[PDB]
Amino acid sequence: GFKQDIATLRGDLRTYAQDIFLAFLNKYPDEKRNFKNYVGKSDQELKSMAKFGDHTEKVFNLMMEVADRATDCVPLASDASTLVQMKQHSGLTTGNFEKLFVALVEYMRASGQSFDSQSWDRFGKNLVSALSSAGMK
Numbered sequence: 121g122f123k124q125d126i127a128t129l130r131g132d133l134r135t136y137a138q139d140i141f142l143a144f145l146n147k148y149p150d151e152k153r154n155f156k157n158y159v160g161k162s163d164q165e166l167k168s169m170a171k172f173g174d175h176t177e178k179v180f181n182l183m184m185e186v187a188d189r190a191t192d193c194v195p196l197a198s199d200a201s202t203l204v205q206m207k208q209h210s211g212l213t214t215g216n217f218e219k220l221f222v223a224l225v226e227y228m229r230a231s232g233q234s235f236d237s238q239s240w241d242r243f244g245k246n247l248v249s250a251l252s253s254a255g256m257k
């Protein structure tokens with residue numbers, strides 16, 4: 121289930137983080153605007169850069185922490201507060217996060233692994249809920 125999916129993702133964090141990030145950017149190329157150092161590069165070019173892996177790994181690790189602390193796929197308000205206060209997400213609306221988890225679920229379902237895609241859907245929705253309640257437009 122959801123908790124084993126955290127263990128599975130964390131088992132190959134750097135790998136999963138990139139392939140999911142790429143799935144997200146390729147599904148929503150309009151989101152790539154937010155990542156100006158990644159514009160104009162293919163999936164392989166990005167993977168070959170050390171900063172791409174470094175950054176995705178950092179993000180995805182925090183995403184797993186938030187998931188691991190979530191109750192029944194409901195993230196802590198104080199974990200949602202952090203993501204809203206982040207000086208990097210300054211812009212960004214709950215739309216962006218919503219889009220992400222669509223790509224995340226779609227990835228898991230296409231993966232072939234026994235991900236509990238439903239729980240990650242439910243987690244993405246409950247986070248998008250917590251983000252607004254934490255002051256995200």
Ligand code: HEM
Pocket residue numbers: 151154155175178179180182183186203208209212216217220
């Ligand atoms: C759980 C979901 C998310 C987590 C945990 C998360 C986490 C983080 C973290 C930790 C950073 C800091 C990067 C660094 O210092 O290297 C960051 C930066 C950033 N995040 Fe997120 N993020 C999430 C969702 C999103 C979404 C949906 C977007 C929008 C598409 C986004 C866009 C960014 C951007 C633009 C930065 C700036 C990083 C940079 O330019 O170096 N994030 N994120």
